[PDB]
Amino acid sequence: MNIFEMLRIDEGLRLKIYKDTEGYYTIGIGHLLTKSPSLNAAKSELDKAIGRNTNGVITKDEAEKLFNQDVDAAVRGILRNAKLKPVYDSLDAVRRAALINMVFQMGETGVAGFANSLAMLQQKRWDEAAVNLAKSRWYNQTPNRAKRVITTFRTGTWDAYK
């Protein structure tokens, strides 16, 4: 298992524009297009992203390509974040994947908001962190996904994904 497979499981794959759990236009493997309520605005951002007139539909390879870029950016963004880097650096490979998943979903700013949980993760207090991570809008809105990521930080294994 790895970051790609893990997010593929969490996000799924859709080749037509769809609305995410928050009602925002998305496509592919969790690629957010826009928070604007307008479908045209989304189609437009989509064409700009693919470099062609898609008419709201893309192929698998195009989806995968957006995905690759999205994962790379999440990593790079973690590495540039003063609040995130030290945490990421302190973690083992499996848990690093949980941190990436979270940035992929919520953005760097969103995660930077789990200040208390981050400190716990850095100190390696797994059970306490898990409990704190659960006290969040994140967990109440997407509980199944959240539990998977939390178990991963708690155990350091991929068991929640097997």
Q: Binding site for substrate: residue ranges?
A: 32, 104, 117, 132
Most distant CA atoms of the chain, gap in Å: 50
Using CB under 5 A, list all residues that contact Cl ion. Answer: 49, 142, 144-145
Tell me how far, at minimum, the Cβ of 70 lies from Cl ion, in Å. Answer: 8
Tell me how far, at minimum, the Cβ of 122 lies from Cl ion, in Å. Answer: 26
Question: Catalytic residue at 11?
Answer: yes
Question: Catalytic residue at 20?
Answer: yes
Quick one: 86 or 143, whose CB is closer to Cl ion? 143
Tell me how far, at minimum, the Cβ of 143 lies from Cl ion, in Å. Answer: 5
Six-digit token string for 47: 């064409």
- 15/13 Cα distance (integer angstroms): 7
Q: Are 16 and 33 in contact (CB under 8 A)?
A: no
Q: Which residue type does 80 have?
A: R
Gaps (C–N > 2.5 Å) in the chain: which residues precede them?
A: none
- 138/15 Cα distance (integer angstroms): 26
Which of the residues 5, 10, 11, 108 is marked catalytic?
11
Tell me how far, at minimum, the Cβ of 49 lies from Cl ion, in Å. Answer: 4
Quick one: 53 or 144, whose CB is closer to Cl ion? 144
H-type helices in the chain, by residue range?
A: 3-11, 39-50, 60-80, 85-90, 93-112, 115-122, 126-134, 137-141, 143-155
Q: Which residues are catalytic?
A: 11, 20
